[PDB]
């Protein structure tokens with residue numbers, strides 16, 4: 550089997566416990582913490598592209614009320630984010646397996662934007678997800694992995710100061 554783990558899941562779990570928030574901006578704000586993925590069971594000599602995207606974990610708009618997050622009362626079906634291609638893509642099994650795969654450069658925006666940046670729906674909750682796409686071979690293949698530990702709400706500003714505190718402590 551191809552095996553796909555989360556690096557620094559303990560760091561991530563400290564945020565999940567509080568309800569994680571990622572800042573989103575006109576031009577795009579990078580993520581903290583950064584999604585880092587351990588990957589074994591690739592073909593060292595095969596070709597893979599690493600895709601990242603962001604599934605609306607539910608169909609609700611969220612709001613900060615009496616110091617806690619709660620869902621609105623009007624679900625819209627959510628489209629998944631556009632895909633961000635890891636820049637080491639495409640690359641050999643052995644590249645992706647030799648060190649953790651960092652998506653340190655992904656930028657999250659809330660605006661109708663040019664390129665690079667991934668536009669998210671403000672105040673919706675997102676599950677990060679990666680697609681390992683085997684390329685070059687005669688048969689294209691996809692393996693997808695979601696990361697519950699890395700769930701967050703897209704915010705223009707931090708609401709829970711406890712999150713802000715953690716973001717500065719571990720940055």
Ligand SMILES: CNC(=O)c1cccc2cc[nH]c12
Pocket residue numbers: 625626627628629630631668669670671
């Ligand atoms: C119903 N609308 C949407 O699903 C939507 C809106 C704005 C940004 C994103 C990113 C992914 N989906 C989005």
